[PDB]
């Protein structure tokens, strides 16, 4: 079976080099030329550059050209993508595949990168306080870093109503992220409701009640 | 300048046909090149779906076709199906600066559900965020189908795209689908203006909702 593997997921800070791989096997790897792509999250295919690895030959696309540096090693079967210098807006999926007279025939898994400048952190939470018959109430997850964190209510008991939602990456470099739940408005007061948060990258367990105004 | 035009969305329900257009330039099309497809699942890598214009590769049932006249190709679909739900992008090697150029993609939506308005919550910074010296407003949309929104910040009545953070839609338990947006603001910003507003448009509607410092 043709296939290309590629590296593990990388978490970096910007100015730090990488170079990640895209190995080919179950087929003669110096033959067919290998395209790397971008994808930032929630958009696009961007192709970044080809090399023919029989000869070095690379192409750039005029948007990456000096930005990143394609290589190859044919004794090995593998194909490179090197930056010198990261920047926190290269956060995103990098695939390669080959060229074939069905083209990207094969395409690797990808290589998530996270580039930022931040150093392991935990969140602050603060309430998100409740203002047909059912009120709105969460937890922000605020400022922390890596992913991921792992939020409940009521130490797993509350699960009706609740959506914990994806986090952001902001341009400070630390993630942020909400959870709310939906519950009746006469049981304001009465119950008590109280997000658990946990970010194990930092050891940080938090126990946020939130209250009614 | 070598570009591949696609809608950004289209959409049809279970069983019904689609058509996806891709159109050229003369670098790419215009030059006399084939136009590939592929397809791309949710938090998968693109898979090979048509090359040299029309040809399947083994696996691709033959409800997916090809074709290119002129500067234009198209990628039909018929007998729609939820797994189908998916990314199209066209692609062809170039005669231009580049050697190869995809199309922006076309989000491909199979109406299996009804359309549901979002539910918008707005959320003014909490007590305990402003003693910590910030502000974020939070402004939480639900229960919306299909997953594609798009969400405008006001302070007063003028835009806000500074400090914006917003998130790609995603499924709730009860498979319609939720998201949410944030405005980073300094407590100064947030207790200078009037009142701030988030304005979430869905299916060309708009729901808004708005909070004011002074307010409780």
């Known amino acids: 079976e043709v296939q290309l593997v590629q590296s593990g997921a990388e978490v970096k800070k910007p100015g730090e080099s990488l170079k990640i791989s895209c190995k080919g096997s179950?087929?003669?790897?110096?033959?067919?030329?290998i395209g790397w792509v971008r994808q930032m999250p929630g958009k696009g295919l961007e192709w970044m550059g080809i090399?023919?690895?029989?000869?070095?030959?690379?192409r750039y696309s005029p948007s990456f050209q000096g930005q990143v540096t394609i290589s190859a090693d044919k004794s090995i079967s593998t194909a490179y993508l090197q930056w010198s210098s990261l920047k926190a807006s290269d956060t995103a999926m990098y695939y390669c595949?080959?060229?074939?007279?069905?083209?990207?025939?094969?395409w690797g898994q990808g290589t998530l990168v996270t580039v930022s400048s931040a150093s392991t952190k935990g969140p602050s939470v603060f309430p998100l306080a409740p203002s047909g018959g059912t009120a709105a109430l969460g937890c922000l997850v605020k400022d922390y870093f890596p992913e991921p964190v792992t939020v409940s209510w009521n130490s797993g008991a509350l699960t009706s109503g609740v959506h914990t939602f994806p986090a952001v990456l902001q341009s400070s470099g630390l993630y942020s992220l909400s959870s709310v739940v939906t519950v009746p408005s006469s049981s304001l007061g009465t119950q008590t409701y109280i997000c658990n948060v946990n970010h194990k990258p930092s050891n940080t367990k938090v126990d946020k009640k939130v209250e009614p105004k | 300048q070598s570009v591949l035009t696609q809608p950004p969305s289209v959409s049809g329900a279970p069983g019904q046909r689609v058509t996806i257009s891709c159109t050229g330039s003369?670098?790419?099309?215009?030059?006399?090149?084939?136009v590939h497809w592929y397809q791309q699942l949710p938090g998968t890598a693109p898979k090979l779906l048509i090359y040299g214009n029309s040809k399947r590769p083994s696996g691709v049932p033959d409800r997916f076709s090809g074709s290119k006249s002129g500067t234009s190709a198209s990628l039909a679909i018929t007998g729609l199906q939820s797994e189908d739900e998916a990314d199209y992008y066209c692609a062809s090697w170039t005669d231009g600066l580049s050697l190869v150029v995809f199309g922006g993609g076309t989000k491909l939506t199979v109406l299996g559900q009804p359309k549901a308005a979002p539910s918008v919550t707005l959320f003014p910074p909490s007590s305990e965020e402003l003693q910590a010296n910030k502000a974020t407003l939070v402004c939480l949309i639900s229960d919306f189908y299909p997953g594609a929104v798009t969400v405008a910040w006001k302070a007063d009545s003028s835009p806000v795209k500074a400090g914006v953070e917003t998130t790609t839609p995603s499924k709730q338990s009860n498979n319609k689908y939720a998201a949410s947006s944030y405005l980073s603001l300094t407590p100064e910003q947030w207790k200078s203006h009037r009142s701030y507003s988030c304005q979430v448009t869905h299916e060309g509607s708009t729901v808004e909702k708005t909070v004011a410092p002074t307010e409780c």
């Open positions: 003369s670098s790419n099309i215009g030059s006399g090149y084939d």
């Open positions: 179950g087929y003669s790897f110096s033959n067919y030329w």
């Open positions: 090399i023919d690895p029989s000869n070095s030959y690379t």
């Open positions: 595949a080959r060229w074939y007279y069905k083209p990207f025939d094969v």
